[PDB]
Design a binder for this molecule. Structure first.
Ligand SMILES: O=C(O)c1[nH]c(=O)[nH]c(=O)c1F
Ligand SMILES: O=C(O)c1[nH]c(=O)[nH]c(=O)c1F
Ligand SMILES: [Zn+2]
Ligand SMILES: [Zn+2]
Ligand SMILES: [Zn+2]
Ligand SMILES: [Zn+2]
Ligand SMILES: [Zn+2]
Ligand SMILES: [Zn+2]
Lengths: 363, 363
């Protein structure tokens, strides 16, 4: 017996196009998404060129429309020059992304005052998400309060961070957050196996106590999102390993295994991969869209999953229970048992759908 | 004609006793204070051993009572073990000091949750001050709001920081701050002259734009405080230079020069070296205490000032106008024209005076 799930949403993926297409592109990354039971993705802006102005967004929209196999929305990225310049295109994006820790020069913000300027100028009804680690979580929460609006914290990875967010929620502050599978299923204990290159990710892998704390505070976690961050094995194993793990094809099987073990319920999972992403990012429903999974099938994660161009996975060797058998997207069979059956270009920009615009008060 | 000033207060000094007495001790540091027109100092807890428990505070109190030539209060320091343990001695301290950036292991806090624990456990009516740079200012402000209390930010050194504090004040948040003379009178432009060892300080010297921003936002600055942080020249010029400048003997002459140039008023100076320190730290008046200064005398800062054991100064070569001529402390001549005339042990712990206890609601 298969279980029918709604179309799942991953609000944090790096699809590398334009400019890093040896690592992934829209066509390969969305194939990976479909194989992982994901029917809608939100793509991050740290491409080359980065999506930090209207022309770069226009290019990205066309590349995505031509290459995506599932539906999508594209983030804009905050820079040190673009506050106050994104108003005309803001509503067409998934949201605004702030890189508040390590990143490349084009997306670096040198001062908290620049964070404030973005919070003040970005339209108040549209999402803002932040890469914010450790004390940076508290700092960006302060900026959000000074500017009287909400913020969403990406990939919470530490006991310190989830407890801070928990305290903020207890005070009624408008903050939401997401957690990535590697911060729930890997830890320092895995670094010996992974090695120093493969093991590089930001936020870094946590201690057993960090992992435990995330599970214990599941009530505080609004969304799961992969932070799919593909790089090739050559890059990961080289002299300057870039941070990041591929994760679209492994996320749902890992979480289904946890459901099967009673670590969280099926509903807990669907709140975090469907309902909460929809409501935080104002993402529209997908008509005639669903995922069929087999919860009984036991398998071992191989050295690489079929679709991502990363061609490696840090979860190699983990035993899982649960598999995606079929995906239907807008009334077409998109995936069955290892075969993707919708072409590049089948996917659409959900922000262009009437039901995908974020509601706002008139001027 | 001399101008009579009230007894000035420096709320941020490192007097190095116990454990670093080759750099300074209570007797030498308070001699330096008196020579700088300061009659009351608040001493930081990063001594060896650090002042992080009741026994260390008891030792420090006796060393200060025996060695101090001016009056004083002693900070307690926050550690990763002492939250919830300082209640019985808290009221006897100047306040609680949090080192939120670089420091030695005993005072290191590894998580924002530890900051929260201190804000929750330290008595709500007593001062908390923080070494908090750049985004750490925003982070500690968030913790203060979550716990519904005030915080004082030490040595604000950057445009970024003073503008964040300005924004917080505009929102009615209970935050105050201090600025050190080196962040008003030195900048990157001075690093060539100082060299990489002498130039080491935390917070680091700022750009011309940082310095300009502090002056332009003088209204945001509640206090001046030296961050007197003495180290010997051997240490500063060695292979592992410790951060810090001596500053007690140079602070007032630098600021008097600025007053003479119309950069701030005499009142602006006295708010920041007398009234605001009193009211933020609940420090008592000193009876029969005053400082006489000569505002006309032009001199050049030498390679070392007479009293601090640091025996060097980063202000060497600067031209100043204004000199301390006489200090009277509690009815005794304490300093005249280069001679200290009160012995070690003349100074008293102001928190033991009836008028020096911080008022609180009964239990
Ligand atoms: O794009 C990436 O590879 C990347 N990888 C990471 O591990 N963290 C990031 O914040 C990121 F932007
Ligand atoms: O004690 C010191 O020397 C010291 N020196 C600095 O330059 N900054 C500090 O925060 C500090 F504690
Ligand atoms: Zn990130
Ligand atoms: Zn995210
Ligand atoms: Zn990411
Ligand atoms: Zn400091
Ligand atoms: Zn201070
Ligand atoms: Zn200090």
């Amino acid at each position: 017996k298969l279980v029918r799930l709604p179309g799942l949403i991953d609000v944090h993926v790096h699809l590398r196009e334009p400019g890093g297409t040896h690592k992934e592109d829209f066509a390969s990354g969305t194939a990976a998404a479909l194989a992982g039971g994901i029917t809608m993705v939100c793509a991050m802006p740290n491409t080359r060129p980065p999506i930090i102005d209207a022309p770069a967004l226009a290019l990205a929209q066309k590349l995505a429309e031509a290459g995506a196999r599932c539906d999508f929305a594209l983030f804009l990225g905050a820079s040190s020059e673009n506050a106050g310049t994104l108003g005309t295109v803001a509503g067409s994006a998934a949201g605004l992304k702030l890189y508040l820790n390590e990143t490349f020069s084009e997306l670096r913000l040198d001062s908290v005052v620049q964070w404030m300027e973005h919070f003040e100028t970005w339209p108040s009804h549209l999402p803002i998400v932040a890469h914010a680690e450790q004390q940076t979580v508290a700092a960006v929460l302060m900026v959000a309060q000074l500017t009287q609006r909400s913020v969403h914290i990406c990939h919470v990875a530490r006991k310190e961070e989830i407890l801070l967010i928990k305290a903020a929620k207890a005070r009624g502050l408008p903050v939401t957050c997401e957690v990535a599978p590697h911060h729930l299923f890997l830890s320092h204990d895995d670094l010996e196996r992974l090695g120093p290159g493969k093991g590089e990710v930001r936020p870094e892998l946590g201690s057993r106590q960090d992992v435990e704390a995330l599970w214990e505070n599941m009530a505080v976690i609004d969304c799961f999102a992969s932070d799919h961050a593909p790089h090739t094995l050559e890059e990961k194993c080289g002299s300057r390993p870039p941070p990041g793990f591929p994760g679209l094809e492994t996320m749902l099987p890992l979480l289904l295994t946890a459901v099967s073990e009673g670590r969280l319920s099926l509903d807990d999972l669907l709140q975090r991969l469907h309902h909460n992403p929809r409501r935080i990012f104002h993402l529209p429903p997908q008509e005639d869209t669903y995922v069929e999974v087999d919860l009984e099938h036991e398998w071992t994660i191989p050295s690489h999953m079929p679709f991502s161009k990363a061609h490696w996975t840090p979860f190699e060797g983990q035993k899982v229970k649960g598999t995606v058998r079929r995906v239907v997207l807008r009334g077409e069979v998109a995936y069955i048992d290892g075969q993707v059956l919708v072409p590049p270009g089948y996917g659409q920009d959900v922000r262009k759908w009437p039901q995908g615009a974020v509601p706002q008060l008139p001027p």
